[PDB]
Amino acid sequence: QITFSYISINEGLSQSTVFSIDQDKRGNMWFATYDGVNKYDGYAFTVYQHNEDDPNSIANDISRIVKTDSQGRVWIGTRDGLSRYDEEKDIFQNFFYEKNGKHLQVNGIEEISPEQLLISTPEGLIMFDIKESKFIDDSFSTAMHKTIASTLYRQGDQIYIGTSTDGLYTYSITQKTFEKVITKQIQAILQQSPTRIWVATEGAGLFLINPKTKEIKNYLHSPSNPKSISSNYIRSLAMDSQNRLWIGTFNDLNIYHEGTDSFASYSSNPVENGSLSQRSVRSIFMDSQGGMWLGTYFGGLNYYHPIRNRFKNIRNIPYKNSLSDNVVSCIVEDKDKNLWIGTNDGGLNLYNPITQRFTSYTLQEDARGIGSNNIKAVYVDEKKSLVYIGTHAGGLSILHRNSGQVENFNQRNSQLVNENVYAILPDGEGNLWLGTLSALVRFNPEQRSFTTIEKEKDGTPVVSKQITTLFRDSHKRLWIGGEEGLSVFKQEGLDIQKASILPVSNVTKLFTNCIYEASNGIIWVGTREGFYCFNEKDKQIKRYNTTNGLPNNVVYGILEDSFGRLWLSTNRGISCFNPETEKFRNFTESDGLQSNQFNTASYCRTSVGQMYFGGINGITTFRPELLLDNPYTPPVVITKLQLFNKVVRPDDETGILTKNISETKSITLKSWQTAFSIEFVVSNYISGQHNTFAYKLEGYDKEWYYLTDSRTVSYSNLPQGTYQFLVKAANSDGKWNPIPTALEIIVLPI
Amino acid sequence: QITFSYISINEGLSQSTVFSIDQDKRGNMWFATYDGVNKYDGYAFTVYQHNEDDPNSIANDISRIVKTDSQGRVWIGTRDGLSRYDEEKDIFQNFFYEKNGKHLQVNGIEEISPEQLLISTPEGLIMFDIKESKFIDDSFSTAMHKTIASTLYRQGDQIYIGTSTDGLYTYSITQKTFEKVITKQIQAILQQSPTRIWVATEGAGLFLINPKTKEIKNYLHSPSNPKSISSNYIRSLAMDSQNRLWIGTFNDLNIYHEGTDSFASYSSNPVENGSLSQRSVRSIFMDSQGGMWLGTYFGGLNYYHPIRNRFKNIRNIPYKNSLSDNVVSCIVEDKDKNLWIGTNDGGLNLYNPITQRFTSYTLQNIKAVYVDEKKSLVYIGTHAGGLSILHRNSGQVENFNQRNSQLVNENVYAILPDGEGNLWLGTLSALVRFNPEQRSFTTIEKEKDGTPVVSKQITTLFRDSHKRLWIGGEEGLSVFKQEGLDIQKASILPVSNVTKLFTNCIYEASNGIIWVGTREGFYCFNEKDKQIKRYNTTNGLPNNVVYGILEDSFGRLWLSTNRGISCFNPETEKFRNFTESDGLQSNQFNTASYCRTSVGQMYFGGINGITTFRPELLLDNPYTPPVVITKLQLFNKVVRPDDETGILTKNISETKSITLKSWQTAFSIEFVVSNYISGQHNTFAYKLEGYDKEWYYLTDSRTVSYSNLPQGTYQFLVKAANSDGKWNPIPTALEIIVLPI
């Protein structure tokens, strides 16, 4: 099971077609597009395009190839010619090879030595001297010089050359020999082992070559066999961290299996979300983290890493057997391990986690009508094979599972006092507690009667208030909560008496959403203004709000995993809370959730251990025990320095930088230079944009300082002296980079 | 046809539920959400939530109502009480009425005088004395004091009070009288005329009240009748600029029609795009521009303005009679007014503009389409396939390639008739002539005299009014004349490097000027004098890669690029750009994806569908609001009213002149314009008087930074231009005094 992330125009990409992908010594990703050259550092895009007035820009917007050498230098192949990105000066060095009047296009770049480069043109092959910054055309033999090369690939000593019609050739650097290997055009060359070389071709298919025996094996497409490759037109080959072949074709993605000798086809699917963005793959690259990048012709980019595969989403698909409405309320698991999902505008859904099937119930024009399509509460009478439904603006609905008939109760037909049932819980005696917007109602199922509660077990007037949630603890006590607040009760038969066990606090008068009893006996209550715990042993309440590390105050539901940690649904994502450390691990929509905003009663933990959180745009389901840790902690790269908000450039009038800010070890600031803001980045693609930075200015700052949403640090009016800036990198999972990034700052007298 | 714009969580809004909407003097929109109070100016949200460590933050996040009064003071109702946003100090003044140990919630706010407010609580009705910041509870008569009010609505002198169970009341400010007008909960009250009053109720439907006759008419929902209202549970009532009533209910939106006495139901539709975000409409408000704002319980906000309603998008709908693939190539209209639409991965599509019927052809990547109307044949050019002939009357397809026929290349990109009876075929290698009567392919290699034809990739073919052939591709462009079956190079273009550029399209304008679209901009050719003028991104073009050119009725041109559509006026050389946010299929468009019907309708395809519009039917935005200076920093530290810097005592928008001391050298000035029609597509013009030599223009940013200025008095000035390019003649002024050092 493999799903992709999407990076396209809306993400900051210049043009959808990604011809070539590479990574530099800094860790930044490089993408060659039909319109521009894109640099991605894990947070922001840096689009490089041609300027007619500025010579420092790239030669042309149409780039076709990108290759990084041994030294870490980035080389681009444009229509106008060759261009190198100078990191030190943050500029482009444009080179042109003019023949017969026009400058020739660069199709492929390959390294011969740290001082030499192999360049392929639509007219032949030429060598570029790096040290002399000039092209040499009188270096190759006549047969080699006029060879039209479509692809270039190096393996240690030998560089393999794929041509348009002449098949395959090889070139030794030491011996300087040009020999054939032995109709169509070659697009990609990749070697698995000294006995296995894979060759991608235009319509000729795939070829496995054993150069030791010179034996060849062809792979073609047949429409009858789905186990074969999808298309004969292939243009990209890559190896993953798990030592597997990745095949990018004109149609779909192919992955070779060693044992079965077959291929797995991964297609562009609009229905099943998470699938490939476009059908035509053109470039595949593995970063240092191991994450696979797929460059398509129209769909932008596709990222995949096993660790980032964390959350699964369940949404409505029109004209398909799927969820009815995206606005999800209560989720209840029965004895059959099925889920009774409630919705706001779609009715009641019955979902089988194995069979993927959905069974809906809606309002009918009079017998299978459920009163209202706005479900809030669900209870399963497993012994009687009945389901009790609580709907907003409808009342109580009783479903007979073995016939499908529905009994409806409201204010006009029955003695029910309120048509808005929000919570259903068994009394233990046989009846049911009904949490409505005005009062609490007891329902006798054997008598079909509604009893409004107005008195305690001593005749203490029960305030007519809003009831949204009901909970029964291990000590068989009833918990009643709503907007008015929380309350605790005992049950002396049918009568209820308030057992005041909570200490006097204004939190008992808070908008109550949910109550959960943890495995350690501690009671946890989630309200609209944070959440808290209740330890009855000593009678204490510890409150937890946003300034404690919580993403949002409005907590809709709490769930406990195998490790004792608590999972919370808010208006701004899901939070993982460890009561011992009192720390938070937060997840947002960008991490893979249905939406940052979640909904009331939309929390469910299965008997197996799976968690289900519903919101406004569907349900997010995951296994907290199965979630993978990110082991990668990349160094911090300082991307930008601004003086008085204006960006400091190398060799600019300020004269602070002559090298790039990334290259700079120390900066000297003159008397008139008082304000500056430093922006930094971390190249973590698994964690993505969820990273913690620790900064400190040695000599000025007393302690370290932490950043979770920001990346820029501003300082002003510093005293004279020599200071040091340090910055550490924590990933999403909380692992640190021990050795920080250091840039010295020298403040001159005033 | 009514379509909405979407504003929600991803747009910057704090929480999806919008209970009430209002607007302030400055033009900022105010939204009361279940979590926080949202302030929107047209560019960014300012979210106000509670802080336990700051007493100048809104008392509670749970906001129920927002109300702006006579003087433009913003009042919020929270679960803790009543809060006012002080504009002059950019703070929040929180007030709490305490009864029985608990602070009471404010459910509704109404203005009595510029010094008095009627406040409704879940326990009765109290008053708030503005000038004295105190609640007065012994002010009203015992009957009025204990009245649980659900909605408040003032009409001139009278304030109409809708209760939860006890019906409707009216309170005159002059006579201090409190009497019932004439069973369920009233949620909204609105007066259309002195004879027409609309009442929204919770489950009791809708009521039309004529107070002069005391006659009442009830409107209820009938499930069998789709003409009636959607639901009985109603909560919002608003009138638009065209004098129409907008009714927001628990289910769907209703719009009253005067003549038929019926209602138009607008539902939440996942299939049809542009529709309502969520079924339940909570609040409806009309801005100063006339645009309608709709607050939903779960979907956020829905904006509608007829002027902004420019584009209709046609996309692929799975399991539905629609477009096959969203990546669209060439589009051709036949004599039957129908559209032959080519796709990259869905084959070929036939579309009826009136019937909405789609017809898809699969293999069981189209790039060229030509219609033979006389023989009822359709010629198809495909990539990695060749040439395909379709008989419209049988449905049989005859396809040709390199392996079966004498065709040299399987990648046909352009088809154009030769005039004799044959067809020109533009392929990635050479040009081929195809005889339809003989079924033979002839590769062109020599000219009329015998000049060798270079093997280059051909992408486009064009015929002008003078019957000349135009050949364009990656190698460049070339002009030819026909001497029978032979062709001669007629070099009418002057010697220029523009001839050797990646060509995409050629179009002859009605005036006779030839327009060529390249990947490096576009240019015109006037044969009358043989002069070429180039236009690129520095001239005002959104992107250099031009895919298609079309002319409208006025003489303007419409161009598709990688960054939207541009409207070019050759007379003034001015550009009018459009992006995805304006309502396009996508910013990126595709090659050959341009079509103008005989009617005048334009069609542009891209990577995410097709966008259709009528350039003559497009409305201009006539609003040019003043610039409001949002924020001021000092060394990237935000300057606050009455702060330690001492620069601001009023708000930055309130302040007309500031004085900067010797050690206060660096600052940044943020500004905004509230144009909800133009959205985020605006142009700012700034200049500092006495320092800047000229005016400078901004389109992306709104922040201007200065540093180390000399001593003396300077004047900052800023103007506002809408998406259409209309200017605000009067600039916003802020005086800056720099002290000697």
Ligand SMILES: CC(=O)N[C@@H]1[C@@H](O)[C@@H](O[C@@H]2OC(C(=O)O)=C[C@H](O)[C@H]2O)[C@@H](COS(=O)(=O)O)O[C@H]1O
């Ligand atoms: C470089 C290569 O192998 N093929 C070039 C490719 O662009 C050709 O056709 C395009 O193929 C694809 C694709 O998925 O790769 C998409 C387009 O639909 C199709 O045009 C042709 C055409 O190139 S063009 O300049 O984009 O028109 O050229 C091949 O060399």
Ligand SMILES: CC(=O)N[C@@H]1[C@@H](O)[C@H](O[C@@H]2OC(C(=O)O)=C[C@H](O)[C@H]2O)[C@@H](COS(=O)(=O)O)O[C@H]1O
């Ligand atoms: C104030 C009013 O007229 N009705 C209150 C409802 O807003 C609350 O229920 C929600 O109503 C709606 C809606 O479309 O307006 C959607 C949502 O699904 C319902 O739960 C109701 C309970 O309040 S709460 O939101 O649960 O806190 O109280 C009604 O009085």
